[PDB]
Amino acid sequence: SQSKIDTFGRYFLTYYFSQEKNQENYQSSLRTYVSEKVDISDWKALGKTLKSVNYYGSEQTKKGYSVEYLLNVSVDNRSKMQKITFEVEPTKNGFLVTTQPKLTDFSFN
Amino acid sequence: SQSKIDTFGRYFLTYYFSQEKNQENYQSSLRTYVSEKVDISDWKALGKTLKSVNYYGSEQTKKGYSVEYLLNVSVDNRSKMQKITFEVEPTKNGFLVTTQPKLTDFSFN
Amino acid sequence: SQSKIDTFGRYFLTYYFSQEKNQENYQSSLRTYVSEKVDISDWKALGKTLKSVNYYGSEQTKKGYSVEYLLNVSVDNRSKMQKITFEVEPTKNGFLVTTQPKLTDFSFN
């Protein structure tokens, strides 16, 4: 679809970027988006305020899709462009995240 | 475009979800979005706050398109996710909503 | 990607609609988004506040894409719907704007 996967990623990103300080509820609040094949026990709140999110396309993978978003994230005191990448897999109506997302510096240059 | 229907729907939703307590003004603020073929005299403010809107795709009808959005709707401080569906039809210069939107519970899993 | 031109255009619009009153700084902050072949020596802050941006689709050109967005701009606290059109060309690494954006009045009717 594209829309569907896009939207799904945005919802996941809302919880992934949550600032809940207690690691247990943080994981619990994002459990539903992440496949059981992934161990989220070491994921915690990332210390980063999500200021904007834009869908940056998908690439077909073997079992699903790799998706990208462009983000403005604020940390410490400064605001910068990142890309976030993660894989998803379709489920019987719906989606699941299947890798830990990678955050990297990005520019259009 | 897929984009143009998307954008049109977002605009309509802003008015559809408006909290105007006077049912006359509520209807007239959305009149231009909705086809004259549709009777909006019982539409009123829904008491819900729209916290977020994501385009969820369309599919063709004989006459136009059935569009879906995923919404975050809030009452008394708490949000839940819903799908909203409604039909649109192209007009010479734009688009019109041609059915009363259907608002339904939704989840990814 | 359609996604990618869309997002690029959003980032550009943020700088293009910046209200920076120093002409050299307004130009510098948007420099990387615009092709060097465009004369940006006379672009100034437009005195308009950008309340919302929705992607409105693209149209292939000889070397790129003509993109459109629907905007809510605010001038005095008087808000209105506008459309903005400009062209964009890929670069091996990303994208560049290649025309000066056209802003025009818009409605769905």
Overall description:
Chains A, B, C: Residues 1-109 form the Conjugal transfer protein-like C-terminal domain. Chains A, B, C: Keywords: Membrane, Plasmid, Transmembrane, Transmembrane helix. Chains A, B, C: It comes from Enterococcus faecalis. Three copies of one chain form a homotrimer. The first copy, chain A, is α+β, with helices and mostly antiparallel strands and 109 residues long. Chain A has one domain (1-109): Nuclear Transport Factor 2, Chain: A (Roll), CATH 3.10.450.540. Chain A contains two helices and five strands, in the order ααβββββ. Chain A has helices at residues 3-16, 23-30; strands at residues 49-60, 65-75, 78-90, 95-97, 102-105. In chain A, strands 1, 2, 3, 4 and 5 form a five-stranded antiparallel beta sheet that branches. The longest helix of chain A has 14 residues, at 3-16. Chains B and C meet through helix 1 of B and strand 1 of C.
